[PDB]
């Protein structure tokens, strides 16, 4: 609360005094918290007075902070220039005070390495992180960034090694423990991740840690995703997750993720209207949680609001993922299938298969959409020969896929008995396809019968023309 | 000096849903208890 009064006093001072570098810097140091543009403007103003009246080069700290603000904004090029200038300035004026400037350069160097990570120069970032760690083995963040980069590469053992190395320096480091727990949970190792996050809650300084409690409740949330016959076990897990989320909401009333967790549990409980209300509230609060968009789209589908669901899925996919996430793509395909746009559903499932051709569920879904499209065309008695032949070819493809999937498939996701029955239905549809193709051929000969009559009449018109000509 | 942390990243800027969400949860619990 006092930071706003300090801002007001400093703003009042700056307006009264156009030339006060310290007031501008003081104002900037509090605008950083919530006003990136305002802090940037204040730092720029301070730099202008330093160059104009003072006629001195900017301090490295101001350049580092300007670069960090640009990094927060997204101007990576300006951030790189400012970080390099800050390193250069700290080096240049190191003789005046080597001890202080060495530490300033250490922080600026870490910033530049983080930027290189942002610019996808992971080799330079890794080399810089290692250079920092070589001289300052107690910089935990460098260990964690190397582990994060290793995890981003996909080398989870290397990531865990870097994370363990960070824990070596700082035995109780909540971020390092969170990173190790996240690694374990991402691998679906529930016990290890649970222990790593409960360890944090065992510590006195983090007795009630919102991040750790949310992860612990998310562990019980993930158990509802897989259907289970045991009703009591599922219901108790729902209650456990809800209790953790409620406690986090009590401790923090602005927690978006506690609210989203409550909505997800409510939706898994079947209360789609209440979950929609929670999601809409959370959605008003922010638009930068992709799970909120996906949960809202799921509720739309459950409420038969297919127009909104398809747009939400497509928009979420476009905004939150640079690559293709086959799970969201499958969600979009299901939404289109419910809406009845089978051609768009087929195209979406083919797009999924393009990226994940080994997915057996995608193959089963493609076969189902092909059978439905072919059956719809065959039932239509106004279809021409070309469409009927294409439907016949598509029925054959579906029959082959269903038989192959029945021979080998992923039993944990879909039952092969259903695939076998689908294969039989495709075979029966093909058996009737002979009559259908005969029907189409007779239809298109009648098409040419009328065409001749059209030509016949036009010739009579020409005959009148000759009568006119003569 | 860093501003964004693992606790403030889970928080909304200002909006509070504690009252509305707990009211909604009370109604769900009330309806659940009423049914038998």
């Amino acid at each position: 609360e006092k930071r706003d009064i300090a801002k007001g006093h400093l703003k009042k001072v700056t307006e009264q005094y156009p030339d006060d570098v310290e007031a501008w810097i003081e104002l900037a140091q509090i605008l950083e918290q919530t006003d990136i543009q305002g802090a940037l403007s204040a730092y720029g103003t301070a730099t202008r007075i330093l160059q104009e009246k003072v006629q001195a080069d900017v301090p490295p700290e101001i350049l580092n902070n300007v670069g960090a603000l640009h990094f927060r904004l997204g101007n990576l090029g300006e951030a790189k220039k400012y970080f390099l200038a800050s390193l250069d300035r700290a080096k240049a004026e190191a003789e005046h005070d080597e001890h202080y400037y060495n530490a300033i350069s250490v922080t600026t160097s870490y910033n530049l390495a983080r930027l290189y990570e942002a610019m996808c120069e992971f080799h330079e970032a890794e080399k810089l992180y290692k250079n920092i760690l070589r001289e300052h083995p107690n910089y935990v963040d460098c260990y964690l960034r190397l582990g994060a980069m290793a995890r981003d590469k996909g080398n989870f053992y290397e990531a865990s090694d870097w994370f363990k190395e960070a824990l070596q320096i700082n035995q109780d480091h909540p971020d390092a423990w969170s990173l190790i727990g996240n690694l374990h949970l991402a691998k679906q190792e529930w016990g290890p991740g649970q222990k790593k996050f409960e360890r944090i809650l065992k510590q006195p300084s983090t007795q009630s840690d919102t991040y750790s409690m949310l992860a612990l409740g998310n562990v019980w949330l993930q158990t509802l995703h897989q259907p289970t016959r045991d009703r009591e076990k599922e219901k108790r897990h729902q209650d456990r997750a809800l209790a953790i989320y409620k406690q986090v909401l009590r401790n923090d009333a602005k927690n978006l993720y506690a609210a989203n967790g409550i909505g997800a549990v409510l939706a898994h409980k079947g209360y789609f209207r209440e979950a929609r209300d929670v999601f809409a509230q959370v959605r008003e609060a922010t638009a930068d949680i992709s799970d909120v968009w996906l949960n809202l789209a799921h509720i739309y589908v459950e409420q038969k609001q297919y127009i909104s669901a398809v747009q939400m899925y497509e928009n979420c996919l476009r905004k939150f993922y640079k690559h293709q996430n086959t799970e969201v793509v499958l969600y979009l395909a299901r939404a289109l299938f419910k809406c009845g746009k089978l051609q768009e559903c087929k195209q979406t499932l083919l797009k999924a298969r393009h990226v994940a051709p080994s997915d057996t569920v995608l193959m089963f879904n493609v076969a189902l959409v092909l059978q439905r499209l072919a059956t719809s065309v065959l039932k239509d008695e106004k279809s021409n020969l070309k469409e009927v032949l294409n439907a016949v070819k598509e029925l054959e493809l579906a029959h082959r896929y269903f038989s192959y999937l029945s021979k080998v498939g992923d039993k944990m996701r879909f039952d092969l008995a259903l695939a076998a029955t689908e294969a039989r239905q495709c075979s029966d549809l093909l058996s009737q396809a002979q009559y259908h193709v005969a029907r189409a051929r007779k239809q298109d000969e009648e098409e040419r019968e009328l065409r001749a009559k059209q030509e016949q009449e036009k010739e009579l018109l020409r005959q009148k023309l000759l009568k006119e000509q003569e | 000096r860093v501003w964004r942390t693992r606790t403030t990243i889970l928080q909304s800027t200002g909006k509070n849903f504690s009252k509305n969400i707990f009211a909604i949860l009370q109604s769900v619990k009330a309806r659940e208890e009423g049914r038998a």
Binding site: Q29, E61, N64, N65, G67, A68, F71, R72, A79, T107, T108, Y110, N111, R114, L115, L144, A148, D175, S178, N182, Y211, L214, A215, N218, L221, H225, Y257, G261, G263, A264, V265, A267, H268, D291, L294, N295, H298, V301, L330, Y331, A333, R334, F337, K338, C345, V361, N365, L368, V369, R413, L418, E422 | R1, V2, W3, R4, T5, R6, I9, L10
Partner: peptide, 24 residues
């Protein structure tokens, strides 16, 4: 009783630990 095979999951995935540039 036939439809697209897709299990709808209501997910609440926490964000990654922030590592923004540090201010001096």
């Amino acid at each position: 009783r036939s439809g697209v095979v897709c299990r709808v999951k209501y997910c609440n995935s926490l964000p990654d630990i922030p590592f923004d540039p540090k201010f001096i």
